[PDB]
Design an enzyme around this catalytic site. Sequence first.
Site, PDB file in Angstrom:
ATOM      1  N   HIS A  55      59.550  85.256   6.041  1.00  0.00           N
ATOM      2  CA  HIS A  55      61.118  85.720   6.666  1.00  0.00           C
ATOM      3  C   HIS A  55      60.780  86.260   7.791  1.00  0.00           C
ATOM      4  O   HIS A  55      60.025  87.274   7.866  1.00  0.00           O
ATOM      5  CB  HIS A  55      61.791  86.246   5.151  1.00  0.00           C
TER       6      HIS A  55
ATOM      7  N   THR B  74      62.632  89.480   8.978  1.00  0.00           N
ATOM      8  CA  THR B  74      63.628  90.755   8.657  1.00  0.00           C
ATOM      9  C   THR B  74      64.352  91.223   9.853  1.00  0.00           C
ATOM     10  O   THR B  74      63.695  91.791  10.779  1.00  0.00           O
ATOM     11  CB  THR B  74      62.850  91.850   8.109  1.00  0.00           C
TER      12      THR B  74
ATOM     13  N   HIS C  81      59.280  90.104  13.777  1.00  0.00           N
ATOM     14  CA  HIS C  81      58.166  89.206  13.360  1.00  0.00           C
ATOM     15  C   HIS C  81      58.377  88.448  12.140  1.00  0.00           C
ATOM     16  O   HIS C  81      59.134  88.989  11.041  1.00  0.00           O
ATOM     17  CB  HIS C  81      57.010  90.256  13.286  1.00  0.00           C
TER      18      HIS C  81
ATOM     19  N   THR D 151      56.353  87.513   8.553  1.00  0.00           N
ATOM     20  CA  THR D 151      54.800  87.919   8.105  1.00  0.00           C
ATOM     21  C   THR D 151      54.398  86.724   7.419  1.00  0.00           C
ATOM     22  O   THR D 151      54.623  85.622   7.132  1.00  0.00           O
ATOM     23  CB  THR D 151      55.213  88.825   6.982  1.00  0.00           C
TER      24      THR D 151
END
Lengths: 828, 828, 279
Positions: free
Chosen positions: B711, B713, B790, B792
């Site tokens: 996802h 964030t 970013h 992950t």
Amino acid sequence: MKVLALRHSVAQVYADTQIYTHDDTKDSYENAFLISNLTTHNILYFNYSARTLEILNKSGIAAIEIQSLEELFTLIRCNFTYDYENNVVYLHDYSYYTNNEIRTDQHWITKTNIEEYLLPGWKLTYVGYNGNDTRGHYNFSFTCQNAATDDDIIIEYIYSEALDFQNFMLRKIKERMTTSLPIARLSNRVFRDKLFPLLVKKHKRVVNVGPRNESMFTFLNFPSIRQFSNGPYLVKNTIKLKQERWLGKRVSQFDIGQYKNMLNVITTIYHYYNLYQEKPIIYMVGSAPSYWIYDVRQYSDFLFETWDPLDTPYSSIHHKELFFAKDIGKLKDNSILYIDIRTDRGNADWKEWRKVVELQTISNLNLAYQYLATGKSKVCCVKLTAMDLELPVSAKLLHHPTTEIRSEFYLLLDIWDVNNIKRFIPKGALYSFINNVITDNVFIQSPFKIRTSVSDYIVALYALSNDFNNREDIINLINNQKQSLITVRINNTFKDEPKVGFKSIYDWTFLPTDFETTNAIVTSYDGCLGIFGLSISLASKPTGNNHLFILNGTDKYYKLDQFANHTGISRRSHQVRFSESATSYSGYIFRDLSNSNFNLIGTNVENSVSGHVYNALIYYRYNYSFDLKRWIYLHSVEKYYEHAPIELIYACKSAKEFASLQDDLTVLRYANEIENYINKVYSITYADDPNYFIGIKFNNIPYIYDVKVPHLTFGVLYISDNMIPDVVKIMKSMKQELFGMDVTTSYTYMLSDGVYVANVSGVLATYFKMYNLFYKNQITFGQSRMFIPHITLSFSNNKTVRIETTKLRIKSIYLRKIRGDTVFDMPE
Amino acid sequence: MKVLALRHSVAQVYADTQIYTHDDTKDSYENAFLISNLTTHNILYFNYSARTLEILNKSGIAAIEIQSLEELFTLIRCNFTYDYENNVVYLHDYSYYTNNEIRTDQHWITKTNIEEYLLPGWKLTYVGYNGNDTRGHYNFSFTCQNAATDDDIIIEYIYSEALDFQNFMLRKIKERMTTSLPIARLSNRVFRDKLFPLLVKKHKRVVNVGPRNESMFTFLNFPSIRQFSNGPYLVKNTIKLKQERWLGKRVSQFDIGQYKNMLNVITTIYHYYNLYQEKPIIYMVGSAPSYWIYDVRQYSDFLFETWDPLDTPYSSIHHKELFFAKDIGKLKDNSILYIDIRTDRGNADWKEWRKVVELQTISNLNLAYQYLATGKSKVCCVKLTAMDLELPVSAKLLHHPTTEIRSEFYLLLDIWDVNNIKRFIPKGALYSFINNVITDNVFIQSPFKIRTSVSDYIVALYALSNDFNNREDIINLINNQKQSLITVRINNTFKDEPKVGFKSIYDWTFLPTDFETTNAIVTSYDGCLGIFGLSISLASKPTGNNHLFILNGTDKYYKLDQFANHTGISRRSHQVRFSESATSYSGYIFRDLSNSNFNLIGTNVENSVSGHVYNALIYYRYNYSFDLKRWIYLHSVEKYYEHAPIELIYACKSAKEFASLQDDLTVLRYANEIENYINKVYSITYADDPNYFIGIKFNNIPYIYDVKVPHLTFGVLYISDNMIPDVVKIMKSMKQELFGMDVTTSYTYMLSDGVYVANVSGVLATYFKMYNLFYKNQITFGQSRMFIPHITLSFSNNKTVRIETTKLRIKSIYLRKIRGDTVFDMPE
Amino acid sequence: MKVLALRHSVAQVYADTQIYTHDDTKDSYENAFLISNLTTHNILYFNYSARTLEILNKSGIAAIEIQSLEELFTLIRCNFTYDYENNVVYLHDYSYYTNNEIRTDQHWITKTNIEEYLLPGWKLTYVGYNGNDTRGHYNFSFTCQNAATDDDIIIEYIYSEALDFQNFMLRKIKERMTTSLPIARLSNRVFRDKLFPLLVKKHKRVVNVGPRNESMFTFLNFPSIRQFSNGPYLVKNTIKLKQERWLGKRVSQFDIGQYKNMLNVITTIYHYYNLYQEK
Ligand SMILES: Nc1nc2c(ncn2[C@@H]2O[C@H](COP(=O)(O)O)[C@@H](O)[C@H]2O)c(=O)[nH]1
Ligand SMILES: Nc1nc2c(ncn2[C@@H]2O[C@H](COP(=O)(O)O)[C@@H](O)[C@H]2O)c(=O)[nH]1
């Protein structure tokens, strides 16, 4: 300056940041000259011929062909060094940080753990010499490669005594993205690479002075060179050292054993080259992994023969997995032997394991003496711990750095280090060497005695100029010596400071005029790149560590308009004349005022004097690439262009005045340095109170006048009364260059009180030639005043009247005796 | 910078020295910006619209139309000042020396003997104000005139105590052809001429501080201004002076009686203006030749009525050839009376002729008292020799220079200088005033008390900044005050030196951030030329006497992109980025390293931060014309462009780091000065340990991953649990600017140890808007870290893998509670 | 350093400002050594022998006998130069300003109008070489004289291009009462006076380099010296000069015709000495 030559029918001007355009077909070298006095840093040259690029590339100005726009033009933006004979571009761009890597040119660092110690995400790669493994990325009309590497960061870190690496590289990576690209530093490894292999063949010998570990690898395929540097450290000089004890000091997160193992060998070889101009077999023991071998083979090809239990990937013969113990007579003589027989403690007790380290050390010496007992030309380099030992005095110690200091240093030996020379050394006298003395340089050969030689081709690039060397000895080494390539620093400052430095060390500073060479160039860095087959895209700065280069005894002293030529001479003046806060005629007004033609600065558009030199004197800091002195001597004696002797003095006199107001005592010296050298290579004589004069009469003067006979006194001379018959030769031989020159008058003026005159124009060039033909025939001609040609009209004080430019022509010419009633020659 | 706009179909690029070319139609504002960040000094702008010239001329950049090439283009090369509303060019070219003249703008010097004292052949001519009599020489699309005059040479010579003039002018004429054109000094007399007559009408009042004899003539048609300067010298302060005797001193070859006769009147008037805001009749006696009258009438029109035996060419009424003796009641009150009743010795005996000089002096005072005995608003200015006299204490002495000092000084009186105030003065107390005290300034009015006022439009151009003035009082005069135009010097040096000078006097030095004004511009010289209707062709230098200008309370505070705008902001950076020894990405790498995005400098082509400010901070010395502070306050509150609050801090933090390595303590201060002003006009809050976060899910990630749910964030926030209902507004109101933004991924990287992630691109602009939208609703959002978006992938340490730029799109958005089991909003 | 040697039975230490005391009979030169490494500027040496004074005076340290206290000791406070073979003290004290005079050593200035141009009340007097007409004021165990003169003020003024004299001298008189006594400058005219006449009789031929008008008068009785300096200006080098016209310039309130009339002769002689070692 970075001239980029674009295709005729394919070429674009866009909203760029530092772009001029130039395009013309006047004359090849006159075009390159007009270019080379352009201001900006990036120049588009739209329609071209190869010879205009040749001249620039020969002048150190990087000038290259561009055939395409998408990548051949956008990537040749960045700065570079160009080899204009093999058409290779050495880029110097640090934009490779963007894809998040550093890059080295030494294979051994790749096999470390260092990538654990880089910032998160970074890597290192592309390991080739000069970036010669970069060229696979680009497909151009020319060969190309980015020679920018980060050897600085890694090697300085080893010599830095700092332990955190991420903190280190983050500091230095930020220094480059802050401060100026040091191009004079990156282009040298290019320069050094091609500078020696041709020099060695051309002269058959060469000596170099002050090599540093910039050149660990340059010379490995050159035995016949003899390098000199700071002497070694000897066992003889341990008696100084205070006693000290084990100091466990760690200064490198990542293991750099391979680096010292590389340096100790390399030191051992340049030593062997020093003794016997030769190059050896290179045996080894105790050193398996040896990823530093491939670095060596990229320069010179050596036979490596290794004894170690573990894997040696890079070698000729890995003879055994047994380590060379006593089968010692089986070695060839022409050799070096590198002993690193060692061990690694496990968890054993350090106090008892120390006994093992002591016994190896006794053995490792027995191997060294038995080696050097039999044959000639044998050099060792042996491993030692710090304990009480019986060592030869004259031997040489090495403590090139390592991972961590834990009591070991290496010793190298020569054949005469065994012949009845031995001393006892205590324990702590070695720790005191280990812990405080880091070896700086593999080049441990004796210093250069500063004196001239006739068999020697001496190179000295950045070794001299140090304050501790006798100034006059290096001066005489430069003046009284042929066959060399010497570098010294320029006095780039004002108030004529003879020694300049960094608050660490001072260095002797020179002008060009310190030296009465015989046949030598004295130019800049960029000029000598041209001489040796190179050209650079960035210009030198007026201040900073600029250096004179001095080529003695070379084939290129007579080729004036080719190398170290009048290229670049007026680049800074044009900036001052038009842009930087002055009128375009500022230089055209000043030099007439400072030479007592101050009444008249109307005719300073054309027919002014002091062209090349006045610019060479006040802006020497920019254009010392032009050796002014070489320019003058080759016009004293015709070996294109010609100016009179008189013009050069007025160029000097005006630079003095200029430097007086400014108070630039260095130009002021440099002006004095030149003018009495002008009076050296040739004398100047002045008929100050003359006897005869050359007169020119005209048909009709379109002005008012009260003098009964207006005339042009074309020049005056003081001679004997029977050198009239060879003066008249010149009256005859140039009668039509006087009848044929465009005499014109356009106005009146006041030459002085009670002397109202006209102005004559377009005659001076003939006047300057005439001066030279009387000159070499040893006839006095001209006064110390500036000859401003004038027709006298009246002895009053009147107003300047302007007319249209009206041509006047010659009734006759005549040679008249001052206050005499007769003449003896008159052409018609 | 000198933008020259050329005709579309008639326009040439030739082998010129400082020429770029620009041509585009992308935007009117954006084009001028791209121009204004160009390097060179002379720019050809080939196809244009009037509004692009308007913006530049408003930005202080001289930008003009060129219709022809032969003379309209070649003569507009040289530097100039342009009034872009009346289309007049004020050239500043000293190339008029070539036709061998100087030029003045005062008629009186032409009637001297000075041409006897110029160098042989020279003259002086073309006597008009600002060179307004030059325009007859040129026939252009615009009005033009060369305002360069040599008033310096003549006037300094008078104040120089040197006697040889040819030596003098030859010295100074050589100073100009050596040193830099002081363009800023020259453009002020233009500036002063149009600065006041509009300012007086707009505010209905004006006070000026520190006027010098630069402005002897500026104000003669402005009674309603009240000037303040150094106070006068009074009779009250002769009691100090040591006694002294006649000193016959000659300091001017040529007679300059007309100059003092001009100054003493002019002093007398500004005095009368000081007392009464009206302007007088000007009677005179003893002063016939009066060629200084025509100089006065070029500025203000006065009635001059003269009594003298000899010719007065320039006056209204020369009443009689009798000199005004006792018919004194016949004068009008609203007046000044200038008495110069005198004599000239023949060959008479100096010891007896002295008696005559004494009696006139007694008489000349009787005339002065009888004048000031009857009416109000009457001023005098009377001739005196040095003898024992009974003088009023409060009166004011004048000794403006003359041909030669031979014992006379003039005294001026006011109505209250008679009302029971009288002292006895000895003889040698006057010679001591004569011989050593040269009056410097006709503006002898009392000093300016440094305090704020609300009726006052205060001008202060080059009077303050002196070290003897209380720093805080001028600071508070600038901060706590509307209605003004103040100038102060910039701290143009490094190591933050508060006081800077010439080794004669020091002056207080400022940064822009010393001042919390309310509605005011703080810009450069060139910026304020634009504000008042001017533009200049030469840029300011990074060092030298640069000065902040400060306009308080003006109509132009909100008009940001017009005046004192982001023009010129990146001019020096582009020089550094590409040319002056650095990679083009140097600024794009440094600021990410200094803000802890040092792992990643790949995506520093685009989506970097800290644009305008980082350049405003480290190169403030070049671009302080851009008032950074005004730029920020008007984006705190929308009164085009928008950046987030977060970006400005990172701009400040990186300039600190930059100035640390450099050790430029002035940027380092200026960075501290700004960032806490950024935290002043608006606060910033940080959810450092947040509770909720905004998450974005995608259809498919084209990478390898081991996290169960990858996802983005998108951002974190710390809020109360019943401000969820107004957070969800923002997600709802911008749901498609998140669905509609070009999310793209192209590679993986290491964000940190054990965190292997992808990179997301093209999202930040929405992220910066979202921060602003939440902000004004007083919702915390974002951490003190830099948000690098970013996705992950895995908790390992792996290699950066590159793919083609693959577009990713949104499954959903969601607002999640950190370590909670439920959400409450998700757009789709 | 100024060693002042005092009488054995007549000698006083008082509350003075820079006084050490020394007294011993160890060894003559070891005592002078121990003295010469003493810190202060004024030293009282209470019981002495002549050889300890000889060594110091030979070492450049002025060391002198003091026989009395009232004026022989109080006036030898101030700084001086001592000829330790003829026992003459050349004082360098500018305290003669207190009785309101300047003093020269050239007779010609006294016949000018200059006292019209001095500050009100001042005079000039006592015109002798090295102040050799000062010694009539003092009656000491040694010969003494104050060689301090104000030749600087007058001569610089002539070479100064300034016209007001009261302003000038008031400036320079204040420079001396502000800044340091330049002793290395005043002791040279003493040095030059005895330096040459003994060199001449000892060395047959001598040559001096760079003499200035410090020495206008030193060499007038020495033909056999050959001085070298900056060359002359010649008619040969007028051809450089730009044309110019009458410039009426006044740079001296008081007439100094006698000064050039003195210099032009003196120039004429050193020339004649240069050609023919003769007089
Ligand atoms: N006599 C002479 N004149 C030169 C020489 N080189 C340049 N010039 C003159 O100097 C000018 C330089 O032009 P600039 O570079 O100042 O635009 C040339 O156009 C030419 O008139 C030279 O070698 N000899
Ligand atoms: N966000 C933002 N970016 C700007 C602004 N002004 C210029 N830039 C960016 O910065 C670049 C400057 O280009 P340069 O002048 O360095 O060639 C522009 O092309 C644009 O990408 C601005 O006001 N706001």
